[PDB]
């Protein structure tokens, strides 16, 4: 309602913000927001745009575009009378004769809705839909455009019961406009409906046939925007309403196949999406088949680089990306049955004199690798050495997929005599790691990481050569690539294992690894993949990590505390402080688990002068069953490594371990069971008070059906470990637990765990020689499994097998040992004197 020197001061203000130089431009925009606080300001802004026609379009339009930003911040500050003025004005001038003004009017309505949120503009929708029937094109198109953006922004909210259900009238209204005379209008009509396909709104699904009918009718439209939208709708219709789309499938795929090759970039990429979406559906294998001979070449043709990407090298989602993505997933559907259609193409492609073609051939070779692996094997003897040659190709992009494609037959390559395929590959991929092109480094280092996962121990003779080129990469690698190098190094250690543990190698690897460790802030986003990397390296280097373990330990304990303190605050600050990422805790716990597991005794010094056990106790209670899981593992690891610092806590830990002995959480319970077992052996006779709390559950878990064998095995190991240090509490149970205990431990190898467990069964039997006599047939089979028992544990088995044959007689035992296989009977007779 304003005037008039102020209007002139705003007009001059609008003028100045359009000036040539940036000096005057970005000093006036200050005054534009010092008035911004006064809500009366916006009344001028809307006026200039919509009423003050005595001014040029650029000025007026800017005014509304200034007003837009005044909504995108302190709209909560917008008074009711001001908003009601803008709403009113915008909704009237919606179809202004001017293009730019109308565009400005539009975007203003949109933003007021999105922030309005949204029952706060009740008239909006029914008034827009009304203007859809307006006789003027401009008002109608402008209304339709506004509606489309409202759908795009607020589909789930229009669909939601929050604004009632306005779609129950918008949808069947939109469908009628599919028939409209204007190419632009039809476009909007379908674009709007498309939003409510996946969300499968009933307002639409109960008009599916009407929709599909209309959709078919628009398939042949010559305006690209319509065809784009029709395609998007059909693709989407795939996931949701296969039922009604089925008895058209062949017509559809003939349309889509044609439409994949459409002249318009956008239509093509949308149509191509159809093939990716279809592949995922069960009713695919038996539908496409007859189309593969025409689909495959079209798909392979799209996989070539676009002139644009070529120049932008030597986006997230190309035709080529989608085209290959589809091919990969198809190769998985059709397996070797796909080869006939692809194989004769590769012939012509992999040797083609234009590099852009060759590249795509190489990319094809890679995509089909998973599903067609078995059928490709006869050609790999020619193909593998050919690609190894291509790595030396002058075009960088030809080198890069070659790395990736080779990485995708990395399993077959190791399945051969190492000098013939693996060794050449290895050497060449190593040179490519230090390629001068970033894209090729990314590729080769990646591929090599992949290769290492498949090689493991087959790299051992090449270690000195791997490391040499791997550490040099440090003083070359950017960041995107550096991150992959951490992976390359991590995997290397994960492959060779203790083979890396040599003075010479540590001299090269650790210094620049610990150098990068230093210049990482606790907040730096590189710790993420570097903890994973040093976690691996520590494990492999075992005790040899000692001189470098100082800082990695303390920085981890920090993280564990950081995350817990973070979490605590979040329990009362879900407005102030943010929920922490608990995966950082989990890696730190695991890295700590591995430092204790690899440095054994030596960790004591670091465990002592830290709150490691405090935090650990807090971690064993965290709501997330991954944290409790990882931290129970650390408990066992610390019990084993330096029990001296743990002991003054066994009072607190045992209860939590007791209440955390729940089989529904497998990994959690496993590590809980395992911790207990590890503790009892260290506690000796002092472990007595804690027996009854955990024992009754462990016997229930061991006599439980459908239990992962490793949890069952660990329980059997743990139970035995208690009845070795405190046999008086565990031995009176033998009857109920002897059956699955023997059934479990007969399959585990003759390792320290097995000995510890059987030493304990023997002790329990010596004290309770009654519980076993009922099911002694199992005790034989459990003892029969031993290939290499220890001198004394031998004598322990005799004492039992003998004295408990003497307790039954010579003729009873004969009859007892009938059900014995030749390996078993002849074994117990050869080992223990029958």
From Swiss-Prot:
Q: Which Gene3D superfamilies match?
A: Leucine-rich Repeat Variant
Spans of HEAT repeats, please give. 6-33, 38-76, 85-118, 124-161, 168-198, 211-238, 250-277, 341-369, 381-408, 422-455, 463-496, 504-542, 550-601, 612-643, 651-684, 692-727, 735-768, 777-808, 811-831
What GO cellular-component annotations does this UniProt entry give? cilium; cytoplasm; cytosol; extracellular exosome; nucleolus; nucleoplasm; nucleus
Give the positions of the site Important for interaction with cargo nuclear localization signals: 404, 674
Q: Which InterPro entries match?
A: ARM-like, ARM-type_fold, HEAT, Importin-beta_N, Importin_beta
GO MF, one example: nuclear import signal receptor activity
Major localization class? cytoplasm
One GO term under biological process is: protein import into nucleus
What disulfide bonds does the UniProt entry report for this chain? none
Superkingdom of the organism of origin? Eukaryota
Q: Which residues form the Importin N-terminal domain?
A: 28-96
What are the record keywords, sorted? Acetylation, Cytoplasm, Host-virus interaction, Nucleus, Protein transport, Repeat, Transport
Location(s), subcellular: Cytoplasm; Nucleus
Briefly, what is this protein's role? Functions in nuclear protein import as nuclear transport receptor. Serves as receptor for nuclear localization signals (NLS) in cargo substrates. May mediate docking of the importin/substrate complex to the nuclear pore complex (NPC) through binding to nucleoporin and the complex is subsequently translocated through the pore by an energy requiring, Ran-dependent mechanism. At the nucleoplasmic side of the NPC, Ran binds to the importin, the importin/substrate complex dissociates and importin is re-exported from the nucleus to the cytoplasm where GTP hydrolysis releases Ran.
Subunit info here reads: Identified in a complex that contains TNPO1, RAN and RANBP1. Binds HNRPA1, HNRPA2, HNRNPDL, RPS7, RPL5 and RAN. Interacts with H2A, H2B, H3 and H4 histones. Interacts with isoform 1 and isoform 5 of ADAR/ADAR1 (via DRBM 3 domain). Interacts with SNAI1 (via zinc fingers); the interaction mediates SNAI1 nuclear import. Interacts with SNAI2 (via zinc fingers). Interacts with RPL23A (via BIB domain) and SRP19; this interaction is involved in RPL23A and SRP19 import into the nucleus. (Microbial infection) Binds to HIV-1 Rev.
Q: Which family does it belong to?
A: Belongs to the importin beta family. Importin beta-2 subfamily.
Name this polypeptide is given: Transportin-1
Q: Which organism is it from?
A: Homo sapiens
State the gene name recorded for this protein: TNPO1
């Amino acid at each position: 309602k304003p005037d008039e020197q102020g209007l002139q001061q705003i007009l001059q203000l609008l003028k100045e913000s359009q000036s040539p130089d940036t000096t005057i431009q970005r000093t006036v925009q200050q005054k534009l927001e010092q008035l911004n606080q006064y809500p009366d300001f916006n009344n001028y802004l809307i006026f200039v745009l919509t009423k003050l026609k005595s001014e040029d379009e650029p000025t007026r339009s800017l005014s509304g575009l200034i007003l837009k930003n005044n909504v995108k911040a302190h709209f909560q500050n917008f008074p009711n009378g001001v908003t009601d003025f803008i709403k009113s004005e915008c909704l009237n001038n919606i179809g202004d004769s001017s293009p730019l003004i109308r565009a400005t009017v539009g975007i203003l309505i949109t933003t007021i809705a999105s922030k309005g949120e949204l029952q706060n503009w009740p008239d909006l929708l029914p008034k827009l839909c009304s203007l859809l029937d307006s006789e003027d094109y401009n008002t109608c198109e402008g209304a339709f455009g506004a509606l489309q953006k409202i759908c795009e922004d607020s589909a789930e909210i229009l669909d939601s019961d929050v604004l009632d259900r306005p779609l129950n009238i918008m949808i069947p209204k939109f469908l009628q406009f599919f028939k409209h005379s204007s190419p632009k209008i039809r476009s909007h009509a379908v674009a709007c409906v498309n939003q409510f396909i996946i969300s499968r709104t009933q307002a639409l699904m109960l008009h599916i046939d009407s929709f599909i009918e209309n959709l078919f009718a628009l398939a042949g439209d010559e305006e690209p925007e319509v065809r784009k939208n029709v395609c998007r709708a059909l693709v989407m219709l795939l996931e949701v309403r296969m039922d009604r789309l089925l008895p058209h499938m062949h017509n559809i795929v003939e349309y889509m196949l044609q439409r994949t090759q459409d002249q318009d970039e956008n239509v093509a990429l949308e149509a191509c999406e159809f093939w990716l979406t279809l592949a995922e559906q069960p009713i695919c294998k038996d539908v496409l088949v007859r189309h593969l001979p025409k689909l495959i070449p079209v798909l392979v043709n799209g996989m070539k680089y676009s002139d644009i990407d070529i120049i932008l090298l030597k986006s997230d989602w190309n035709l080529r990306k989608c085209s290959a993505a589809a091919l990969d997933v198809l190769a998985n559907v059709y397996r070797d049955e796909l080869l006939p259609h692809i194989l004769p193409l590769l012939k012509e492609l992999l040797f083609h004199h234009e590099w852009v073609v060759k590249e795509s051939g190489i990319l094809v070779l890679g995509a089909i690798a998973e599903g067609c692996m078995q059928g490709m094997i006869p050609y790999l003897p020619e193909l593998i050495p050919h690609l190894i040659q291509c790595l030396s190709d002058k075009k960088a992009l030809v080198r890069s997929i070659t790395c990736w494609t080779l990485s995708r037959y990395a399993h077959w390559v190791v399945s051969q005599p190492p000098d013939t395929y693996l060794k050449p590959l290895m050497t060449e991929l190593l040179k490519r790691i230090l390629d001068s092109n970033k894209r090729v480094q990314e590729a080769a280092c990646s591929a090599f990481a992949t290769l290492e996962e498949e090689a493991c121990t087959e790299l051992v003779p090449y270690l000195a050569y791997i490391l040499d080129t791997l550490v040099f990469a440090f003083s070359k690698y950017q960041h995107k690539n550096l991150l992959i190098l951490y992976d390359a190094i991590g995997t290397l250690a994960d492959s060779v294992g203790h083979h890396l543990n040599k003075p010479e190698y540590i001299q090269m690897l650790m210094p620049p690894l610990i150098q990068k460790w230093n210049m990482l802030k606790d907040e730096d986003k590189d710790l993420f993949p570097l903890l994973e990397c040093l976690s691996s390296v520590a494990t492999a280097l075992q005790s040899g990590f000692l001189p470098y373990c100082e800082p990695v330990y303390q920085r981890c304990v920090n993280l564990v505390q950081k995350t817990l303190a973070q979490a605590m605050l979040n329990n009362a600050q879900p407005d102030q402080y943010e929920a922490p990422d608990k995966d950082f805790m989990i890696v730190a716990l695991d890295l700590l688990s591995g430092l204790a597991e690899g440095l054994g005794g030596n960790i004591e010094q670091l465990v002592a002068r830290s709150n490691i056990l405090t935090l650990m106790y807090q971690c064993m209670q965290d709501k997330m069953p991954e944290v409790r899981q990882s931290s129970f593992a650390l408990l066992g690891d610390l019990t084993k490594a330096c029990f001296q610092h743990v002991k003054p806590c066994i009072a607190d830990f045992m209860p939590i371990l007791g209440t955390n002995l729940n089989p529904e959480f497998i990994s959690v319970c496993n590590n809980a069971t395992w911790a207990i077992g590890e503790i009892s052996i260290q506690m000796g006779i002092e472990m007595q008070p804690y027996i009854p709390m955990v024992l009754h559950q462990l016997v229930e878990i061991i006599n439980r059906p459908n239990t992962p064998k490793t949890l069952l095995e660990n329980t059997a190991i743990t139970i035995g470990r208690l009845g070795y240090v405190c046999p008086q509490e565990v031995a009176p149970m033998l009857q109920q637990f002897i059956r699955p205990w023997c059934t479990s431990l007969r399959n585990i190898r003759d390792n320290e765990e097995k000995d510890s467990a059987f030493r304990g069964i023997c002790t329990m039997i010596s004290v309770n020689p009654s519980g076993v006599i009922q099911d002694f047939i199992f005790f034989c089979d459990a003892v029969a499994s031993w290939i290499n028992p220890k001198d004394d544990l031998r004598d322990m088995f005799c004492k039992i097998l003998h004295g408990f044959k003497n307790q039954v007689g010579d003729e009873n035992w004969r009859r007892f040992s009938d059900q014995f296989p030749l390996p078993l009977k002849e074994r117990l007779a050869a080992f223990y004197g029958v």
